[PDB]
Design a protein around this ligand. Structure first.
Ligand SMILES: NC(=O)c1ccc[n+]([C@@H]2O[C@H](COP(=O)([O-])OP(=O)(O)OC[C@H]3O[C@@H](n4cnc5c(N)ncnc54)[C@H](OP(=O)(O)O)[C@@H]3O)[C@@H](O)[C@H]2O)c1
Ligand SMILES: NC(=O)c1ccc[n+]([C@@H]2O[C@H](COP(=O)([O-])OP(=O)(O)OC[C@H]3O[C@@H](n4cnc5c(N)ncnc54)[C@H](OP(=O)(O)O)[C@@H]3O)[C@@H](O)[C@H]2O)c1
Ligand SMILES: COc1ccc2c(c1)c(CC(=O)O)c(C)n2C(=O)c1ccc(Cl)cc1
Lengths: 331, 333
């Protein structure tokens, strides 16, 4: 018997504005031996996500940061999760974790070795499912429509654009760098603009689509959303997925949208949470995402930070827009 | 047969509104009308509407133009076979006492109109605002029975109809209005709860007090900060019908902070704007017949806030925006 030392990232201090390296503190803990019905997990790939900026509020200062990871079962006294098997675990930022099967999800069966397991945290996982349902259910695209997506080169945004493309939609993206814009055009976005460098957001959205937009997949909220409303087609739909423009500054209230746009254009605005879709419909969506990736219809890119010690940085840099595609940390 | 000249009075927009409208923004003009040509009719205003939309629509006017709006008018004289002298029409002829029409923009009054119902109802409960309430509640909110419904400006033209249709459809209704008199009126016509949003110590407390289980639909007539407060009270997958936003009409370019993304996402709320004119033809006509039936059955009680005299019309409009009116604001010429 050898002692397993689990390293964990803790919330040393609550976030003020943008998170900093010193808001985090590593702890090391010797784990106990497994009881029957339990497994020992070792992190392979750990996700960092925007929601961690929000969820960190409810944490008691000193607790382990929340999050999902892909982990290998090292030791098992649980027959549902044999040693060597791979699981999705809501175990937070930790190198090793003991579970009784509680928050454990088996990866899609028939998972191809050609596909990196870290895709289970992105395109073929929660962000991909958010994109799938937000676009296909909330916006309800069926072909011919013009779709705008913000944070277009991120984990959710990249999938939205490419699914909208395969559905026969015209797709416009807004992202935060020229490199991101170059990438977006090369994966099928019909138009893409850098939102930081616009002369006028109004004219940028006008140039991208002079006839306006059928669907806005909103990842950023704030004043971007407000400007978008003025350019929605009548009876247009806005899927409120996130509001990242207002996560680092939840204290500073964003100015009101135009009642004129919402009323005159008779717009529909709908917030959604990915977890709303369960059972058969969720499994089918995961199979769809898997198939579209295997068919090269959803290209993927992962923004990989190598090393568990670098996990705080990966999260900070992702919030600031360093990532093209899903931000993932390898142990 | 000797003919006498007709003098038409009109209220013009002297100056575009800046913040709250005032009397000085309006200028009365008197025009001697030409004789009727063949195909034309002379109309005399009976009842003229004042409405919130006029605060926004005014921005498109050229200064010196007649203020826009709908009226119930009588055909005084007619050289148009389609419009008999003595018949009653609705016309979007604006704030004017008399006008000449070639028939183009004239809506014949709803047939089978009973004497016992004041014609001015055609501009409120059995008219545009009643249709707004009808479709806003039944089609946008989509009530089926059992829902808890919140309505702002509850004692106004639209709001009073909303609450009463909701009660006859089997819903629980909560109203917010700006005076104690209005609150007592709301309770009297069947609202389950009603509160004065101006005088309550906390707006959030009053909403939780009125409905602990929260709200299935909010029929929003006011928007602004009031709407922001309501979202925290909404039920999961609740609906907000964006009918109007009167609390911001005076400050469209200086808006207050907007809705909470947390509330909209976390509760998965559905917000929809709508325009009453979306519903036309048979669906619109049936809605009107339904409204009249429910009025005649006593399921929809009405009150009108009547201003006597055309020269009092700008004041009627100003005070309606300021909340003087219980029920539909209307000017009797
Ligand atoms: N409703 C749901 O169930 C659900 C689920 C998952 C995610 N979400 C939401 O979806 C959004 C994207 O999530 P993700 O996981 O795909 O992350 P992501 O897009 O891969 O990463 C976040 C990106 O947002 C952009 N960003 C950061 N600050 C911004 C700001 N000030 N204004 C505009 N853009 C900014 C950055 O890219 P740029 O270079 O383009 O600025 C950054 O790369 C988030 O808002 C998240 O909360 C919602
Ligand atoms: N979408 C459409 O097709 C359509 C059609 C018709 C009407 N509307 C809208 O529906 C709303 C009501 O119309 P209406 O014709 O029935 O007018 P109304 O309610 O009869 O009269 C306006 C009322 O708004 C209230 N109000 C004024 N300022 C306010 C403020 N700052 N905060 C909260 N309430 C305020 C006042 O009542 P209180 O005493 O309660 O404050 C006032 O009596 C308006 O917003 C209008 O634009 C929309
Ligand atoms: C426990 O199931 C959920 C469901 C949805 C959630 C979260 C957790 C968290 C994390 C948390 O618990 O705070 C976030 C951030 N969720 C959002 O979708 C969201 C996104 C943007 C805004 Cl603005 C508000 C909410």
């Amino acid at each position: 018997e050898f002692m397993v030392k689990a390293k964990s990232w803790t919330l040393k201090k609550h976030f003020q504005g943008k998170p900093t390296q010193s808001d985090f503190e590593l702890k090391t803990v010797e784990l106990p031996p497994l009881k029957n019905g339990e497994v020992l997990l070792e992190a392979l790939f750990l996700s960092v996500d925007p929601y961690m900026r929000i969820a960190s509020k409810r944490l008691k200062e000193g607790a382990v940061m929340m999050g999902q990871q892909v982990a290998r079962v090292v030791e098992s006294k649980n027959s549902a999760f044999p040693a060597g098997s791979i699981v999705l675990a809501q175990s937070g930022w930790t190198t090793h974790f003991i579970s009784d099967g509680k928050g454990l999800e088996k990866l899609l069966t028939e998972w191809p070795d050609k596909l990196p397991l870290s895709l289970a945290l992105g395109t073929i996982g929660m962000p991909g499912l958010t994109a799938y349902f937000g676009l296909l259910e909330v916006c309800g695209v069926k072909g011919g429509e013009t779709v705008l997506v913000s944070a277009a080169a991120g984990a959710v945004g990249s999938v939205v654009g490419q699914i909208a493309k395969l559905k026969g939609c015209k797709v416009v993206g807004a992202a935060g760098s020229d490199e991101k814009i170059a990438y977006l055009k090369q994966i099928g976005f019909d138009a893409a603009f850098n939102y930081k460098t616009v002369n006028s957001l109004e004219e940028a959205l006008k140039k991208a689509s002079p006839d306006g937009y059928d669907c806005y997949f909103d990842n950023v909220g704030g004043e971007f959303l407000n400007t978008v409303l003025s350019q929605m087609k009548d009876f247009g739909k806005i899927a409120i997925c996130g509001a990242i423009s207002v996560y680092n500054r939840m204290d500073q209230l964003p100015p009101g949208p135009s009642p004129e746009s919402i009323i005159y254009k008779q717009l529909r605005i709908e917030g959604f949470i990915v977890y709303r879709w369960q059972g058969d419909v969720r499994e089918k969506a995961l199979r769809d995402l898997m198939k579209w990736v295997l068919e090269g219809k959803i290209q993927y890119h992962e923004h990989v930070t190598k090393g568990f010690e670098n996990m705080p940085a990966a999260f900070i840099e992702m919030l600031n827009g360093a990532n093209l595609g899903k931000a993932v940390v390898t142990a």
